[PDB]
From a paper:
In 2016, a research group from Keio University identified a novel PET-hydrolyzing enzyme named PETase from the bacterium Ideonella sakaiensis 201-F614. For PETase, the portion circled in the structure is the active site, which is much broader than those of the other PET hydrolases; this active site may explain why PETase can accommodate a large substrate, such as PET, at moderate temperatures. The enzymatic degradation of PET is a two-step process in which the enzyme binds to the polymer substrate and subsequently catalyzes hydrolytic cleavage.
A flexible linker (GGGGSGGGGS) was employed to link the corresponding anchoring protein with PETase and HFBI separately to prevent interference from occuring between each anchoring protein and its displaying target. To explore the structural difference between wild-type PETase and linker-attached PETase, the crystal structures of those two proteins were determined at 2.0 Å and 1.5 Å, respectively. However, the industrial application of PETase faces a substantial problem, i.e., the enzymatic activity of PETase toward hcPET remains low. There was almost no surface erosion on the PETase-treated hcPET film, suggesting that the enzymatic activity of native PETase against hcPET was rather low.
Numbering used by the authors: 2 to 264
The structure:
Amino acid sequence: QTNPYARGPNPTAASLEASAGPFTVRSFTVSRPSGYGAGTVYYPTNAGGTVGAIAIVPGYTARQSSIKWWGPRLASHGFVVITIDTNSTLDQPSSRSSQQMAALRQVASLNGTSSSPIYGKVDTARMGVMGWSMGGGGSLISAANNPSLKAAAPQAPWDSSTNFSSVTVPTLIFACENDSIAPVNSSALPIYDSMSRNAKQFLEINGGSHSCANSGNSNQALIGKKGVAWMKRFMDNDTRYSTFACENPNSTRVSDFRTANCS
């Protein structure tokens, strides 16, 4: 009769492009991180039911400030988000994946802790992974090793191997056209091309440097619209987002677009 995971009013193009969605957002610092360096948790106060969880990791030498804007933007549409700092700023993708999954593990334990702000707010069976550069490589390793994850959306990914043909998780890849650290022709695009068994999408930002999807970027309307809709459609099975998730935006800010196995 109804989707038990659907939350919030019917989405529109304007509402997905605004800086904030429908729910009020609060946040707190993790007092004693378990297996990673530091973490901030963003959550909705009034979503009307339990919601899925997303863990986000930055890149080599980077910290939480680079990916922070995703916290309030995703949480305000009905998600619990944890953004992390790694044990060392110089950790490699394999280690970054380990710490991303330890962060999801701790969010799950906080759901059962009555003193926590997110006590009872999380559906621990529905989780997803995001991250930038080496942390986006780490996100793909996480999905390849843990196929119960519901969604993946790395940005400017990099890894020592481009072969991710074992990934069965729905994966959205954000790429930046003018990336000189993890160039599209030698990382993001071969990574996308290796995935043969999943719903997938490739979205390359016109004229974008390596940090084209970080906090402060000038395409937050489009990037945020696509990120929220992808997570809504595949973590929540919410078919109100099916067109927003799979469609070609037909935008002057996208220089390359590709999708497979979506509808």
